[model samples]
Target: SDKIIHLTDDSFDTDVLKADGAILVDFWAEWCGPAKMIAPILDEIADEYQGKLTVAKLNIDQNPGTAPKYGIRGIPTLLLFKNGEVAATKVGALSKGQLKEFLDANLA
Candidate 1:
């Protein structure tokens, strides 16, 4: 019953950089194949980690400011934020297990 939040440049700071706990922000775009590939996995993760981790998405094409601020040079990059700071980052495509491991490693 969880949903991935669609983040924009305007809301990035407020929703992610200023938030508490852990947040997984998927930096992606419509043209990114890997991004689209991981969409459903993120959806499942949103539900699976409902109370623990917050899942979000930011489209580099639409929200230009936020990505550059984080030095996002690639599509489908996953940034893990903890206590309002970046804890970890994963670039390129990944499987569900890999994603889980990524989150677990940082969230722990």
Candidate 2:
């Protein structure tokens, strides 16, 4: 089964904003090269983190209502949320190790 949870505009608030644990949300678009490049890295992150964090994906093109609120002006934006608030944000693609560093630095 897929580790990432796909998100929509209607589910953003309830899924990421009001969630109990840390959530690393990937804001991306299907046609964006960098966004596609980071997909597997993100998947590995989701698998590694397991219970410690939640990995979610939001397609900006398909769900246009939430990105603007978070000021997501670019593709492959990684927004880390903790306790229902944005804890950190990384724009553009990152290596698997870099993303693990990001999760390690932000989670707990």
Candidate 3:
């Protein structure tokens, strides 16, 4: 699937900002428990919404600069970007249904 791309600070612009379709960027760190819990769900959502959306992960510990630029103060923050601008923001662990509803509402 085209979902769940691993992003680094160096490739953020090309991989995400200039991405062709809707993008969901997960800002997380390796040691965050909530983020770890949300990872599987995110992956599943990525699989479920495979072609419609582009899911991505950014390791905050590694990409410190971009994280703060987005004002991501917590792990598991999901930033939804559409056409090069932020369309929505989810700031914690989210259920599959909640995520689905969010995507439906925003992507429309």
Encode model 3's per-residue lDDT on 42-63: one tens digit a residue: 8898888988998899988878
Which ten contiguous residues of candidate 3 have the minimum total lDDT?
1-10
Q: lDDT (CA) for every model shown?
A: 0.88, 0.88, 0.86
Model 1 residue 61 lDDT? 83
What clash pairs does model 2 have?
Answer: none
For residues 32-67, could you state the per-residue lDDT of candidate 2 as single tens digits?
A: 898988888888878879999999999888798888
Q: 2 or 3, which is superior by TM-score? A: 2
How far residue 43's Cα lies from its native spot in candidate 2, in Å, is 0.9
Judged by whole-model lDDT over C-alpha atoms, candidate 2 comes out at 0.88
Error of 2 at 38 (Å): 0.8
Note the clash tally of each candidate. Answer: 0, 0, 0
Over 1-108, each residue of candidate 1 has an lDDT whose tens digit, in order, gives 214798988998799989988999999898988889999999998888988999999888878888888888888899999878998899998999999998988788
Instruction: Sort all candidates by lDDT, best to worst.
Output: 1, 2, 3
Output the worst ten-in-a-row residue range by lDDT, candidate 1: 1-10
